[PDB]
Structure formats: C-alpha cells, structure tokens
Ligand binder design. Structure first.
Ligand SMILES: [Zn+2]
Lengths: 166, 176
C-alpha cells in the first residue's frame, strides 16, 4: 500500500539530501574516501543539507575525521546510517533526534577536499552499499530499490516494518 | 502528557522496554558484583536477573543483531547484542543457548536465547544492559516502562532528550 511507502521512507534513507539535486531530474560521482563508496555532490559552500531519513545524530564531529572534515553520522532504524561530510557548519549535536528532511548542516570544503561538495554515504551495518540505489529511490520509483540493492534482506525488513503500524 | 496512543505504541516497538525474561527469583545491579570483563565491583553495568538455566530470553524491541558470541565461557560468555532505533542498544549475556545470528533483523518479543551461566557470571543469571549511543542507562526504568506506565523511561533524561524524540515520532505517526 502507498501509505506504507511514506512510512518506510521516514525510516530508511532515500532521495538527495541537497534540494537542488532532488529538483532537477528526480522531481553525482562515486568516490571512496574512507573504505566505503560515497557520492560526491558538487555544490557551493553553505548549501543547506537535510537528513535523508529520521534517526539520531550518532556523531556530530568537528574534526579531520579521516579526511571527511566536519561530519555528521545519522543512525537510522534497522542498521542504516547516513554520512554527511566536508561540512562548513553543523547545526545539530550528538544525541539529537532528527526527522526526515530536517536541516542538519551546511555544505563546505573541510577535510580532504579539492573543491566544495557534499560527500554523502548510506551504510548498512558493515557491508558495502551503493548510495545511488537510495538517492534514486523515491515515491514514483519505489519498488526499484529492492531489485537494485538485493544484498539487503528486504523481505524480513518489510514484514517487520509493516507490523509496526497497527 | 499530550502524547497520542500511536506515539506511545511506536515508541514501545522501537525502544527497549519491558521484561526480556519472564521468570526470575530476583533482580540485582551488576555494579554490586564482580563485573564480567572488568573483574571488580562498582561498575555501572546494567542488571542481573537471577533465573534458572534455560529460561527463555526475548528481544526488548525491534532492531538488528549486530553481535553474537556462542560457545564462550569467558567474560560475558554467550551473548546477543541488538542495535535498536534512535541510538538504543540492548545486550543479553551469560546465556546457555543463542537462537539468533549476527546481522538478522529482530522483532520485539522474539526469542533470542536461553539464559545460563556462561562466562564470568557468578552463577545462573541473565545479564542485561540498555545503552544509548554506547552509554550505560538505568535498565530498571526501561523494564517498568509500558503503555500504562509511560513516564518511567522518560525519567532517564541525562543523555536523552525525550521531548525531541517524541517530536520525531509525531512526524512519523502523523501519516495515518
Ligand atoms: Zn567524496
């Protein structure tokens, strides 16, 4: 059911976390920074950055962070995490609860960075994850992510998520 | 407070609560015994249910198994650690048998293991911890938290900003 789509989309990361990227084609290049494939989203310094799903800010770290620069890690339900790196400014703290689409920081050029961009990652536990499978995942192209990121045991996760409602 | 039914229901599926073991003779803080890893008293480290061998153990909320040990007789012994939503984790220790595997999804109420005395247990018991971003919480406040006694967990507010959390949950439940 379509109600389940929205609900699922509050909990599991999806869409682009910069507004200008979600507008142009949905309504981006692959880069390994620290052991995981991120996505680099070219954009000017201080471009607002939004949470891809609801969760807790697991880390809001103002540091070098392995070359990530200023870094937010949002911990989502069921072992999903999102990383937002090279930030110029962080407007949430460690332990803050955020909702999907909430402003969490502003883009920058901090850390190991050649020009201003957002470095974005979707993680699931400890296994490699393609971020495009989640950034392209949206309300129209909804079923897609089950066939694009097959390595997640969706059948168990869907069942469990559907049980949460009533 | 002004929290709706749906908010409370979702919270109690996602955040650890209630009894992970349904038979015990007593509950004691682990602080008052020799800690499993750090062999000393005086460590804030959750609680122990004094329970017979092979008493079923249940997951205190939905989530994912991030760590398991089986056939261990040192330290914590056999254990399950579940990662929950919103930074919470629960750990179950000194088990005799483990029923789940690392990386599996978990539902609240699911059988995860059976209590024992494996590791540095001081005998037959379940050792249980609730944690928020790795930080040790008062497990008793989560035990006593249910639909009818909802304030209990909100009293543990040193690390956790409960109003902010329910604001996030309101947005989620608002959909229906
Ligand atoms: Zn990058």
């Amino acid at each position: 059911t379509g109600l389940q789509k929205s609900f699922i989309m509050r909990l599991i990361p999806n869409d682009y976390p910069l507004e200008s990227y979600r507008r142009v084609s949905a309504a981006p290049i692959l880069h390994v920074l620290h052991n995981h494939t991120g996505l680099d989203l070219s954009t000017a310094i201080n471009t607002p950055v939004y949470a891809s799903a609801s969760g807790v800010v697991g880390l809001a770290s103002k540091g070098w962070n392995g070359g990530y620069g200023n870094l937010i890690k949002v911990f989502h339900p069921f072992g999903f995490k999102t990383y937002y790196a090279h930030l110029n400014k962080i407007v949430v703290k460690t332990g803050e609860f955020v909702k999907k689409g909430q402003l969490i920081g502003y883009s920058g050029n901090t850390g190991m960075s050649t020009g201003p961009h957002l470095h974005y990652e979707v993680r699931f536990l400890d296994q490699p994850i393609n971020p495009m499978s989640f950034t392209k995942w949206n309300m129209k192209d909804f079923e897609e992510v089950f066939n694009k990121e097959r390595s997640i045991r969706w059948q168990s996760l869907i069942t469990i998520i559907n049980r949460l409602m009533q | 407070d002004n929290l709706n039914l749906a908010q409370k229901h979702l919270a109690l599926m996602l955040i650890p609560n209630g009894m992970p073991i349904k038979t015990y003779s007593a509950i004691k803080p682990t602080k008052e015994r020799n800690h499993p890893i750090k062999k000393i008293k005086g460590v804030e480290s959750g609680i122990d249910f004094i329970a017979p061998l092979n008493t079923p153990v249940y997951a205190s909320a939905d989530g994912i198994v991030d760590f398991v040990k089986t056939n261990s007789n040192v330290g914590y012994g056999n254990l399950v650690r579940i990662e929950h939503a919103f930074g919470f984790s629960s750990i179950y220790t000194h088990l005799d048998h483990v029923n789940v595997q690392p990386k599996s999804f978990i539902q609240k109420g699911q059988l995860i293991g059976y209590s024992g005395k494996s590791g540095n247990s001081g005998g037959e018991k379940l050792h249980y911890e609730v944690r928020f971003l790795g930080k040790i919480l008062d497990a008793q406040k989560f035990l006593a938290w249910d639909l009818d006694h909802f304030q209990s967990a909100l009293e543990e507010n040193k690390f956790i900003e409960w109003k902010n959390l329910f604001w996030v949950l309101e947005d989620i439940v608002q959909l229906q």
